[PDB]
Amino acid sequence: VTLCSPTEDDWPGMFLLAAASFTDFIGPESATAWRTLVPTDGAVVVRDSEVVGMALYMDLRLTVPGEVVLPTAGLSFVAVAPTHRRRGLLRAMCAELHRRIADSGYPVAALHASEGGIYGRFGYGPATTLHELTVDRRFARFHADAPGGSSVRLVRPTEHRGEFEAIYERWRQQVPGGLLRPQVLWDELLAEAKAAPGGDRESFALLHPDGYALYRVDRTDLKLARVSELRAVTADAHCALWRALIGLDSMERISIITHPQDPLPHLLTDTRLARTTWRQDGLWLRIMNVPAALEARGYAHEVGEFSTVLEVSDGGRFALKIGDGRARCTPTDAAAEIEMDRDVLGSLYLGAHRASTLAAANRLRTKDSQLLRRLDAAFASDVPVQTAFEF
Amino acid sequence: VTLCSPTEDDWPGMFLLAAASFTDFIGPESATAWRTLVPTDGAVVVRDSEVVGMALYMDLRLTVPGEVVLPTAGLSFVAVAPTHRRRGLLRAMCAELHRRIADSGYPVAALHASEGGIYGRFGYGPATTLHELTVDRRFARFHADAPGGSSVRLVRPTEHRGEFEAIYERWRQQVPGGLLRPQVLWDELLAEAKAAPGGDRESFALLHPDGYALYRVDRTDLKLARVSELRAVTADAHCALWRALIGLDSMERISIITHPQDPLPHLLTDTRLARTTWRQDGLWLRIMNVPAALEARGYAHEVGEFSTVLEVSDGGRFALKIGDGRARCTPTDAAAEIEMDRDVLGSLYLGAHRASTLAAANRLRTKDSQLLRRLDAAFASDVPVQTAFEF
Amino acid sequence: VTLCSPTEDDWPGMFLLAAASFTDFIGPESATAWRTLVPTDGAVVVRDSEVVGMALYMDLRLTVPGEVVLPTAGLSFVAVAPTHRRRGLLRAMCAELHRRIADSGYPVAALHASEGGIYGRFGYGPATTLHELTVDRRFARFHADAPGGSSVRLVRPTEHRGEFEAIYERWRQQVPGGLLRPQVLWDELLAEAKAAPGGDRESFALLHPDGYALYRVDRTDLKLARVSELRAVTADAHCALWRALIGLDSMERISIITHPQDPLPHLLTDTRLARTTWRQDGLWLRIMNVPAALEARGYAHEVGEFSTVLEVSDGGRFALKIGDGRARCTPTDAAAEIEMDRDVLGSLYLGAHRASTLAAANRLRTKDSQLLRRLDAAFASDVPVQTAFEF
Amino acid sequence: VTLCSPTEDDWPGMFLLAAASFTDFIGPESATAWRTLVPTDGAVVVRDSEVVGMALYMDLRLTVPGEVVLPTAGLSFVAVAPTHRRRGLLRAMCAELHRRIADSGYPVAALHASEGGIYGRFGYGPATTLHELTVDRRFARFHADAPGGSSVRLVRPTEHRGEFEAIYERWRQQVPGGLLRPQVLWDELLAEAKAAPGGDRESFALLHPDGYALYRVDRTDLKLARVSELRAVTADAHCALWRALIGLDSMERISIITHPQDPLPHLLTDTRLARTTWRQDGLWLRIMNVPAALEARGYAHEVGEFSTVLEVSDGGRFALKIGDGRARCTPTDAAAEIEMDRDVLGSLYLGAHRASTLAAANRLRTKDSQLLRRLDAAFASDVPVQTAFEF
Ligand SMILES: [Cl-]
Ligand SMILES: [Cl-]
Ligand SMILES: [Cl-]
Ligand SMILES: [Cl-]
Ligand SMILES: [Cl-]
Ligand SMILES: [Cl-]
Ligand SMILES: [Cl-]
Ligand SMILES: [Cl-]
Ligand code: NA
Ligand code: NA
Ligand code: NA
Ligand code: NA
Ligand code: NA
Ligand code: NA
Ligand code: NA
Ligand code: NA
Ligand code: NA
Ligand code: NA
Ligand code: NA
Ligand code: NA
């Protein structure tokens, strides 16, 4: 077993491991598109010769609270051959990529987890929450207060690329969890909008000046419309799009993977009709440089100036001062007032998890309940954290 | 149709309407127990003579943020005969009970809703969130950080009444959503802990000095344990009880109806094992007296002093000043800065819903985004809102 | 194997065979009640000594077209021990009972069939059709034309026996398929109206001056109400009862076993909401005396006088003259114009099956298509055929 | 919103609305084939410019009782964009098409309804009944009386087009509900007989001189054969085809969408094996010209001459005389003896619904029960009403 950056010769072997590892494998053509996001030394392979392990990262741009955009290393295409389990190959590959990511000057790494029990030990914490809502649209009536009681157009996605790009670009800069979507990923998205023989049905779009929804009828449940993506920049756009989706009179049910603070339920006279059918971790974060990440994001202006000493387990100890919505984070050997593993800081960082909830599980440790309330308020996001697109 | 306080003669007719209206009807013996919580003029019937409509309220004590206990009118046993639908009987009965509740000096009314689309128009807003977690305990491993790596005892519920009463009494005074559980409801709870021929299996309890869990094996799914109630006063107690439940080696799955901030997921090495299988509105609140309710609860000390003008639709307009965790709420004819229906204030009141989320649905209306952030922070609860027991 | 009328000593052995043969066995107490309807020589047993075969008939009164009530032998409690299959015991028992029934002067025998492939060969034809309608009552709206836009009362069945008896007695005399329901069967019906530990839920009744509905919530599907029986003497009563059932706001679905001409679908703005979920043969008829049965019923006055020659396979050949809604049916050796097996005549007799449909299957054989149209019209019932109660 | 006849330029926009509206959308190539049945001014669009509403009719030939063929306007391709619900677009489009259909001289319009609650208010009544039978062929044995105890050939559909056309043409002229099937619809039918990658399996045909059956194995249930179409001109052909289908020894079940008077059950020794698994409205009729439609069909010769006065709600009042199987229908201001909405007359017109059943729902109103019996008999069809093909 040797750990190397792959040569062009290695990629057929990587596509074999990928096809055998990922049931949702996009195939070599699509994989080659995504490859354009992987920097020169962004990939590692293990050879036994045949490829028995692989991992890479892509150059991403992640929005964090305060509309701050961080360069982010997006881990992806991580696989160990079923022949080479329990030989420390994942640990070796993650250690090497983290070395390269830290040396390259990324303050943050991110991934989508295949299972929930794997990445905590490598310092990734779940930082966004996926929330599936299923609406029985047959009963759905809009509240008298709901905006916009036609601004929306039913269109072919492939004919309005420019408009979706412009709306998404405005959305991703305003929302924590937002990711820059490069041209190659717009190519890939509009390719999956087409009907496939034996596969997905045709996708349609609802287009508003300030929002869009991409949806298709389920392959097998012909009374279910699945919203693949809804991006709205204004409340008027969000409501108008949902009025149009609830107008899909041939459907019984509309489903969407959204975030816990989606206002959809409050648009209806019966909030219970917007049923939570599924909940899971979305984006995971590893804070690579604690002071860089903590100084870079904005904090709630509602909390008054405070100082503390934060220790990250094997991540350093810092004098952390938060005031006027900004943090200063400097080295100190003073006694820690707060201790947590690196994964816990990732979970706190976009505002998806409360310091108080993590403290109740003893993942976050302080003797000061006032400090806990101050951290909770400071790390909270004004704009609710959302998940952009899986990678 | 005449609307009257029922005589003793009316109660057999009320029990008939109840049996026909409520599939979960506890029966006349249990109903007579709960009746001891209904004050002298706490009930209305409609006669056509036979009972075709009924509604009552019980005298409750509800904990709100700041550990403040409010006298609360708990609406219950609300039914219209299937023969007398669409004749305004619900509206007539609710109007009369609200008159009596307001005149009696209750600042707040509360209920559990049979359907989500009914009580908004009578000024009730959903104020707590039920969250069902299902744990596949076969895979569950506790995190190295989790407390208490034996303080817990497996016991017969009927033999440790005193201990459950004492623990519950400590829990309900500390948690917003907490309700005083009178002696008659402890009688009823321990009666439902017994096995029934053709019905529920025997209930067992796990007892800690600072917490308890009541559970039973599902009637039909013999690999599922259903936790009917877990009350823990400390994090050590919460973790210790979950270590014991995960030790139910004959079960595949443990389910509990809990709240969105339950720390259980963070106790495990795989947070995904604590799956959200169901989410619904719990307790609904109608604010009867706006200034009394707003002055009575505690507010977050993290937000700096601020003043605004709040208008409740047909509920009055108030100068609202919040500072040092207290509110002053006085009559004013000054221009409104914030407007909302009465139901919306109920949804905000225990901290379960953010002002910002309601604003995004246009249920809450202001031109000031800074005011919105201040309301969000002020109305937030330090201790997460939980649901006590259904009534 | 000897075939005998049973002595009192035989009945414990008959109750053992019954319990082993009938999963719906009502038990010895209920069986003893129904026994009061079995005349002195109304039962046969086969002994091998232990009971290995049994069959009996009850004295019934059946309404046929023209509101004519026929003495009817109701076959029931027919069983062969699983140890004694394929030994001709059913054929021997049926032959003996038919001998006794014919000699006793019954013009007609009737039964409910355990399976569809058994009784045709003994001359029974299916004569009524069971039609299960399931209404999704959440969507159900009554048509502007529907009668009665409160005449109906929600009551305890056991408290209004007299009223149900009087309504049923009016219904059974007006409807072909109607059966006299003796006092012992009213005792049995009101006993099954009670909740059972581990069994059925409590039954309720909707009572109108000219109709009633008995219903209960399903044991396991708590959003389904099952109507066990709806008897309405007028269209106003039928509509009023359905308005009340659709008012069961806690239910998603109402199901009823009714007849193909139930007007319920036409009461709604969406006829499709009254979904046919199940269809089966109900009452089976064996015509014992062809001329007695054919002369006894009324015929459609719309068809002009006609004469034909009907041959029943091993049942005789008859000159059949139909006019002014009456038939004369006399012996003849003239050439047959119509031939059919005895079972086919049973299927025609209450108007549930058209001569033309049976002719298309070659169960009914004529060279005259005009004769076929005349038989179709003559045998049709003005009042649609319904099924009274299973026996 | 303007309502126009579409130009060629509009049809791409109509195909977009169609694809988004109809999950069973046949696609632009097939849609262009069906278009050949739409006359010059047979289509309307609503433009907001983009197509937000559409409706058309096709020139059909419908067989009614007495083997009379009526020119029929077949409404189809009716859609409102999900963006433009509740703006009266359906009402506007239906009003314009009905104007054009009436002015063009069509006595009748027809459609297949997407939902049951929509078309009643525009004067369409359900006029045929779809009845799905599922046969467990493993148990199926033919009755000793059943015809034809080999006349049938297993063939490739595409090789025997001429024979299917000739048989169908004989069937459609003899059966009420029969439609002329133009060459373009035979092209489309034989195209759907081919296997599709990820779609339907290959279709086979059973061919008799006087009947055919088209069938295929279900996509997912490989023990179910689905009969798409069985057309038999004689009882011998019907029985012979069913003997062949019951010979599909690799299948457990055969399903067919047929009519309520299908003789299949009576061909078997166990009639219960032909299970009704589904029942729904088929063809809907709007009578455009009451006297033209009522004079055009044949009536039962069994009923003696009678006269009445029929009022159709906003459809005129007529002296209706029926005798010798013919109707004369003339204007009158005499008192109405019978009143009904236009939709009700459509439901009566092919004989699928009895006047007596509609009267019991108060959709048909008379004080004369003798008149009701006479209408029932007169409007009855000698040959049972069937459904030809959906459009
Ligand atoms: Cl912020
Ligand atoms: Cl999201
Ligand atoms: Cl607080
Ligand atoms: Cl809770
Ligand atoms: Cl009659
Ligand atoms: Cl019936
Ligand atoms: Cl005819
Ligand atoms: Cl048909
Ligand atoms: Na923002
Ligand atoms: Na690409
Ligand atoms: Na993924
Ligand atoms: Na507290
Ligand atoms: Na009690
Ligand atoms: Na409840
Ligand atoms: Na009658
Ligand atoms: Na009895
Ligand atoms: Na039975
Ligand atoms: Na014909
Ligand atoms: Na074609
Ligand atoms: Na169709």
Side-chain angles (χ1 to χ4, degrees), chain C residues 24 112-114 389-391:
Chain C
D24 54 40
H112 290 262
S114 60
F389 59 77
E390 311 201 323
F391 65 78

Side-chain angles (χ1 to χ4, degrees), chain B residues 21 23 50 82-85 87, chain C residues 150 152-153 201 244 247 249-250:
Chain B
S21 296
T23 62
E50 294 178 324
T83 52
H84 283 78
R85 300 293 183 190
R87 282 147 160 109
Chain C
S150 306
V152 179
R153 291 194 283 156
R201 302 178 86 86
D249 283 2
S250 41

Side-chain angles (χ1 to χ4, degrees), chain C residues 128-131 171 175 230-231 257-260 262 385-388:
Chain C
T128 79
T129 304
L130 302 176
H131 204 103
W171 175 87
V175 176
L230 193 157
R231 311 297 180 196
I257 301 165
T258 190
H259 65 279
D262 194 315
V385 57
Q386 304 177 29
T387 312

Side-chain angles (χ1 to χ4, degrees), chain D residues 2-299:
Chain D
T2 73
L3 198 139
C4 301
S5 297
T7 67
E8 193 64 15
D9 284 331
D10 287 314
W11 275 90
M14 295 169 72
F15 293 158
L16 174 54
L17 185 51
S21 296
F22 312 127
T23 62
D24 54 40
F25 179 49
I26 60 183
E29 276 197 30
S30 288
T32 300
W34 285 73
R35 263 189 71 177
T36 72
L37 301 180
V38 179
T40 290
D41 283 302
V44 294
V45 289
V46 181
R47 288 199 224 75
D48 183 66
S49 22
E50 294 178 324
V51 173
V52 299
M54 64 189 184
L56 51 77
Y57 75 84
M58 297 173 280
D59 184 56
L60 301 184
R61 293 286 182 281
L62 172 64
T63 305
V64 312
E67 296 186 348
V68 169
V69 179
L70 294 189
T72 300
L75 264 73
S76 193
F77 223 60
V78 178
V80 174
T83 52
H84 283 78
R85 300 293 183 190
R86 299 181 189 262
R87 282 147 160 109
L89 259 50
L90 175 59
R91 186 166 282 281
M93 287 191 297
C94 284
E96 176 59 17
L97 277 189
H98 287 164
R99 209 135 50 216
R100 300 188 181 188
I101 289 162
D103 290 351
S104 294
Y106 287 97
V108 165
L111 57 83
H112 290 262
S114 60
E115 315 167 22
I118 299 172
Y119 282 114
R121 69 177 89 90
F122 304 120
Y124 292 83
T128 79
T129 304
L130 302 176
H131 204 103
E132 190 185 55
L133 295 177
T134 305
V135 189
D136 193 338
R137 58 142 299 280
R138 291 173 308 168
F139 299 113
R141 303 292 187 270
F142 285 84
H143 203 278
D145 293 345
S150 306
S151 45
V152 179
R153 291 194 283 156
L154 174 67
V155 306
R156 288 192 196 285
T158 51
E159 292 175 2
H160 299 272
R161 176 167 175 149
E163 276 145 305
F164 300 144
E165 284 176 347
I167 293 159
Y168 181 90
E169 179 61 10
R170 290 154 65 196
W171 175 87
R172 74 92 183 171
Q173 288 180 283
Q174 292 171 23
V175 176
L179 294 170
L180 192 171
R181 183 182 255 155
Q183 286 306 310
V184 289
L185 297 195
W186 283 109
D187 297 345
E188 287 299 304
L189 178 64
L190 291 170
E192 293 173 0
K194 310 195 276 257
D200 288 330
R201 302 178 86 86
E202 190 177 1
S203 287
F204 302 103
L206 301 163
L207 184 59
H208 185 276
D210 299 317
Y212 68 84
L214 269 37
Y215 77 90
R216 76 168 111 230
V217 176
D218 186 76
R219 285 186 197 188
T220 58
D221 184 355
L222 270 43
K223 300 305 180 79
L224 173 61
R226 288 199 187 279
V227 177
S228 52
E229 191 171 314
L230 193 157
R231 311 297 180 196
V233 178
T234 72
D236 281 357
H238 181 253
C239 186
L241 287 167
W242 271 108
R243 286 184 183 280
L245 286 163
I246 297 305
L248 294 171
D249 283 2
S250 41
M251 300 296 100
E252 284 175 9
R253 280 161 291 108
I254 319 298
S255 65
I256 191 175
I257 301 165
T258 190
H259 65 279
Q261 298 297 328
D262 194 315
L264 173 53
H266 302 297
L267 292 178
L268 309 182
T269 61
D270 184 354
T271 60
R272 211 184 271 187
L273 287 176
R275 225 157 31 93
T276 308
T277 40
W278 186 75
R279 251 177 82 101
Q280 194 160 104
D281 47 276
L283 188 73
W284 292 58
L285 287 188
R286 182 182 198 279
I287 305 310
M288 305 296 301
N289 184 319
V290 173
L294 288 188
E295 288 200 346
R297 67 155 279 187
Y299 297 85

Side-chain angles (χ1 to χ4, degrees), chain C residues 248-264:
Chain C
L248 294 171
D249 283 2
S250 41
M251 300 296 100
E252 284 175 9
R253 280 161 291 108
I254 319 298
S255 65
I256 191 175
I257 301 165
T258 190
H259 65 279
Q261 298 297 328
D262 194 315
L264 173 53

